[PDB]
Design a protein around this ligand. Structure first.
Ligand SMILES: [Ca+2]
Ligand SMILES: [Mg+2]
Lengths: 152, 141, 69
């Protein structure tokens, strides 16, 4: 199933993360999610836990061979579509015009689901250049597209 | 390894020390070079330096003596930009806790003894590691 | 049970979106992570060279000679 092209990318990334926790041929089980994110997949935290991800640095460490199957197991995780995202945000849109207030945007991002930190929230709003208007409203559809299409 | 610009540097260094234009560095070249720079070592220290070469000190011998010790070294600029990598706002400093962490717990970890000798004489003030000054120190004793 | 199912799906959809944000943040940082890897190799290797070579008389000479060219 896994293209050799893909196995190569996994090695490259694996070695980067190996280096970054102390070169020794193993990546911390806590960084499992991030390796995979670098490879272009978007697992929920609950996914990476199901494949062996730990809650904290220093509990377990994986050599490449134990890591490959973790990756293969997340690779098929469910990923949100744009339609799903719009439906979700629409439940917070009070008049269905396409706006949501910035405070609400922050409530859903750091108060629901797998809650993101204030720092993480401020950063995605920064990177996506999402501005609110004079009454504190933002268009969730722009934000959704910017996040989906990625940093490049 | 080992890069041309570094080979060109070793060659230029060999050439200046070889005051005779011998093609060999001998004890006279060394006394001459040392005396041009400051205190000149006694003839014992000089001969001991020369005995590190298992033969007449020509350029290929000079290479034997320096190649391994220099092979992985980088210019002052390269090293300052390596530090710059962790200095986003270009303050020309690093938090002492930050650089200690990088060195000790990431990459090719520094053991407790490497950390001790690294920070014995490092220029650190108010929690700030002066990496520009630090680079100067590791390039010039 | 249709109301519980609805709350769960909305909550999963948000989590997937947060997954998308998490993804974006890491990929955003990747390139700098690679450069820093190189940077930190430069720093550790060069400090290590210094520690070995700083009391070696040949090096002390070599370094006084290098600024002259
Ligand atoms: Ca490691
Ligand atoms: Mg000569």
């Amino acid at each position: 199933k896994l293209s050799q092209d893909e196995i190569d990318d996994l090695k490259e990334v694996f070695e980067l993360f190996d280096f970054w926790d102390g070169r020794d041929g193993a990546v911390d089980a806590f960084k499992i999610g991030d390796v995979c994110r670098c490879l272009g997949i978007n697992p929920r935290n609950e996914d990476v836990f199901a494949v062996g991800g730990t809650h904290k640095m220093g509990e377990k460490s994986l050599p490449f061979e134990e890591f490959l199957p973790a990756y293969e197991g997340l690779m098929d995780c469910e990923q949100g579509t744009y339609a799903d995202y719009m439906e979700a945000f629409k439940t917070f849109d009070r008049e269905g015009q396409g706006f949501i207030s910035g405070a609400e945007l922050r409530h859903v991002l750091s108060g629901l689901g797998e809650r993101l930190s204030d720092e993480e929230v401020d950063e995605i709003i920064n990177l996506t250049d999402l501005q609110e208007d004079l009454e504190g409203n933002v268009k969730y559809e722009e934000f959704v597209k910017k996040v989906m299409t990625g940093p490049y | 390894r080992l890069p041309q610009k570094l080979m060109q540097e070793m060659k230029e260094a060999f050439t200046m020390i070889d005051q005779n234009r011998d093609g060999f560095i001998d004890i006279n070249d060394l006394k001459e070079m040392f005396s041009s720079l400051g205190r000149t070592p006694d003839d014992k220290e000089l001969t001991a330096m020369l005995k590190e070469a298992p033969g007449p000190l020509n350029f290929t011998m000079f290479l034997s003596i320096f190649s391994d010790k220099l092979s992985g070294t980088d210019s002052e600029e390269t090293i300052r930009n390596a530090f710059g990598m962790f200095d986003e706002l270009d303050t020309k400093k690093l938090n002492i806790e930050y650089i200690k962490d990088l060195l000790e717990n990431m990459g090719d970890n520094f053991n407790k003894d490497e950390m001790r000798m690294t920070f014995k004489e490092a220029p650190v003030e108010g929690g700030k590691f002066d990496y520009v000054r630090f680079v100067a120190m590791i390039k010039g004793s | 049970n249709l109301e519980e199912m609805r709350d769960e799906r909305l909550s999963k959809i948000i989590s997937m979106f947060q997954a998308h944000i998490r993804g974006y943040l890491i990929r955003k940082a990747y390139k700098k992570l690679q450069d820093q890897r190189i940077g930190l190799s430069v720093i550790q290797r060069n400090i290590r060279k210094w520690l070995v070579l700083r009391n070696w008389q040949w090096w002390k000479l070599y370094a006084k000679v290098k600024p002259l060219l």
